[PDB]
């Protein structure tokens, strides 16, 4: 029954609609139930890329995030923490990360690291006097205006956006 | 206008004539070296068919002035070096977001396609039985 | 902030309701044609027996 | 950098200016005089047109100090940021490709919503006809 | 061979005609930008007579396979990025003692 005819929505009384999502949930209950639709199979098959060592990584940190919130809720289920913090907060425990508090000079500091330290701050020192200057003022000048062509435009498309929706509506109400 | 993957300004832009539409050229090279095919058309196209588009130097500003870690004041190898791990991070965070919406909508279409299906069959008993 | 937080959200949700209503205006004119072929086939039917 | 005949570091380098290749100066010269032409392009090459490349006196140090540890550290700044570029580069088109099947399902899951709500519409019409 | 200026294995490996040595491209590049001359030399050098030195495939091959090999063991990127701040860190060192001295 491939041709389901438009019904008038105001015309049926809600309890036959409150009948019909029952029967449904009935039929439902009666469909054995795949953990993936069939018609579904087709678009996630698409996903399959090449195995990048990225795609490891990711997978790796996904599926021991997955072992984790497990873990969790199985001991402490009132920590509302977001999946979010919990995913960052294993992150930063399992893989080494880039330590620049190991650059705060220190008397019992070793010269060799005093003078790594020395050596950034030099640097750092020439950009700030010589260069950044010249040039900040004009990349904020240059951000700011593409960032507001950028807004522009895409306030201009959400116009043409609800116009397209009105119009679609307007065709739908002839037919 | 934004690279139609990284969804950042591209630092050297080309054109699919597929999708007629503006890519990073690394990432899309690569694309194209991955499956043979436009990113969002999925039809077949070479690396000989990219367009790569000339950049007047107005457009080489506009590309080191975004997104570019000379907008502030506090740029030095250090805070490159924190700036970078940054990024990655919340790109990882932004993986893992992606993979666990993907999951919870893979589940959410799959619980509504198995109603829709109970609804049709529902409608056809009906059907059935008035006409018998 | 603007960008971001309004204007892209606000492009992406006015799409995906043209898309929805643009395949249901796409079943509405089949569910029409249809019943006109319902209609003729009926008829046929009946000249059938 | 490899002799293009014979795969080997050669001991006394030397570019021919045709191939713009590196040679054994007396594997280039003795290919020369048998032939005359470049080994590579066979275009006409003579021995005075062949650029004998001078190591540097701090080459001439540091390939003594190549057993030095630092050397083989396999972790030269261009290398790490040229690996830390492809690694963007893939998780880029990894994201790419979620965000794309997301998309597609949330369009799927638009479509089935329709159909579902048609389907139990057609039905609670059927069932009035049927109750009557 | 090792770049003259970096001391490193070059991944663009360029010719200077003046001074018959081997350069990493960019570095060559932005000298003769900024001299006009050739660092070895102090001759004259434009950067249209620099000699791109064009790999053979088997070196290509050798500076993917040799990065590829010896990076396989730590590529995961966290490994990368301490790498790389443990590679500024002794360029700074080196620095800082040539200033120093």
Same mark, same amino acid.
């Given at each position: 029954?491939?041709? @389901?005819?438009?019904?008038?929505? =105001?015309?049926?009384?809600? =309890?036959?609609?409150?009948?019909?999502?029952?029967?449904?949930?009935?039929?439902?209950?009666?469909?054995?139930?795949?953990?993936?639709? &069939? $018609?579904?199979?087709?678009?996630?098959?698409?996903?399959?890329?090449?195995?990048?060592?990225?795609?490891? @990584?990711?997978?790796?940190?996904?599926?021991?995030?997955?072992?984790?919130?497990?873990?969790?809720?199985?001991?402490?289920?009132?920590?509302?923490?977001?999946?979010?913090?919990?995913?960052? $907060?294993?992150?930063?425990?399992?893989?080494?990360?880039?330590? !620049?508090?190991?650059?705060?000079?220190?008397?019992?500091?070793?010269?060799?690291?005093?003078?790594?330290?020395?050596?950034? @701050?030099?640097?750092?020192?020439?950009?700030?006097?010589?260069?950044?200057? +010249?040039?900040?003022?004009?990349?904020?000048?240059?951000?700011?205006?593409?960032?507001?062509?950028?807004?522009?435009?895409?306030?201009?498309?959400?116009?043409?956006?609800?116009?397209?929706?009105?119009?679609?509506?307007?065709?739908?109400?002839?037919? | 206008?934004?690279?139609?993957?990284?969804?950042?300004?591209?630092?050297?832009?080309?054109?699919?004539?597929?999708?007629?539409?503006?890519?990073?050229?690394?990432?899309? $090279?690569?694309?194209?070296?991955?499956?043979?095919?436009?990113?969002? !058309?999925?039809?077949? @196209?070479?690396?000989?068919?990219?367009?790569?588009?000339? &950049?007047?130097?107005? +457009?080489?500003?506009?590309?080191?002035? !975004?997104?570019?870690?000379?907008?502030?004041?506090?740029?030095?190898?250090?805070?490159?070096?924190?700036?970078?791990?940054?990024?990655?991070?919340?790109?990882?965070?932004?993986?893992?977001?992606?993979?666990?919406?993907?999951?919870?909508? !893979?589940?959410?279409?799959?619980?509504?396609?198995?109603?829709?299906?109970?609804?049709?069959?529902?409608?056809?008993?009906?059907?059935?039985?008035?006409?018998? | 902030?603007?960008?971001?937080?309004?204007?892209?959200?606000?492009?992406?949700? =006015?799409?995906?309701?043209?898309?929805?209503?643009?395949?249901?205006?796409?079943? $509405?004119?089949?569910?029409?044609?249809?019943?006109?072929?319902?209609?003729?086939?009926?008829?046929?039917?009946?000249?059938?027996?």
């Amino acid at each position: 029954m491939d041709g @389901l005819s438009f019904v008038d929505k =105001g015309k049926i009384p809600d =309890g036959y609609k409150n009948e019909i999502d029952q029967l449904v949930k009935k039929e439902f209950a009666n469909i054995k139930r795949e953990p993936v639709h &069939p $018609e579904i199979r087709g678009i996630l098959a698409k996903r399959k890329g090449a195995d990048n060592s990225v795609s490891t @990584l990711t997978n790796a940190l996904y599926t021991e995030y997955l072992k984790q919130r497990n873990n969790k809720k199985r001991r402490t289920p009132d920590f509302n923490d977001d999946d979010d913090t919990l995913f960052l $907060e294993e992150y930063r425990r399992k893989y080494p990360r880039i330590d !620049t508090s190991r650059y705060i000079p220190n008397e019992s500091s070793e010269v060799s690291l005093l003078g790594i330290v020395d050596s950034y @701050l030099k640097h750092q020192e020439i950009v700030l006097d010589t260069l950044l200057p +010249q040039t900040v003022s004009n990349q904020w000048r240059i951000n700011n205006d593409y960032i507001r062509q950028t807004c522009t435009i895409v306030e201009e498309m959400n116009i043409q956006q609800r116009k397209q929706i009105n119009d679609l509506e307007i065709y739908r109400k002839r037919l | 206008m934004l690279c139609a993957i990284s969804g950042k300004v591209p630092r050297r832009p080309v054109l699919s004539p597929k999708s007629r539409t503006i890519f990073e050229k690394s990432l899309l $090279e690569q694309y194209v070296k991955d499956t043979g095919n436009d990113p969002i !058309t999925n039809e077949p @196209l070479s690396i000989e068919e990219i367009v790569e588009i000339v &950049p007047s130097a107005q +457009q080489a500003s506009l590309t080191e002035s !975004t997104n570019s870690a000379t907008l502030k004041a506090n740029y030095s190898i250090p805070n490159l070096l924190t700036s970078l791990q940054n990024e990655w991070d919340a790109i990882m965070l932004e993986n893992f977001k992606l993979r666990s919406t993907l999951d919870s909508l !893979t589940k959410k279409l799959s619980t509504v396609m198995y109603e829709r299906d109970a609804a049709k069959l529902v409608a056809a008993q009906l059907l059935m039985e008035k006409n018998e | 902030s603007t960008l971001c937080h309004h204007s892209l959200p606000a492009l992406i949700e =006015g799409q995906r309701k043209y898309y929805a209503d643009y395949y249901a205006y796409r079943q $509405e004119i089949r569910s029409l044609e249809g019943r006109r072929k319902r209609l003729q086939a009926m008829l046929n039917s009946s000249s059938s027996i």
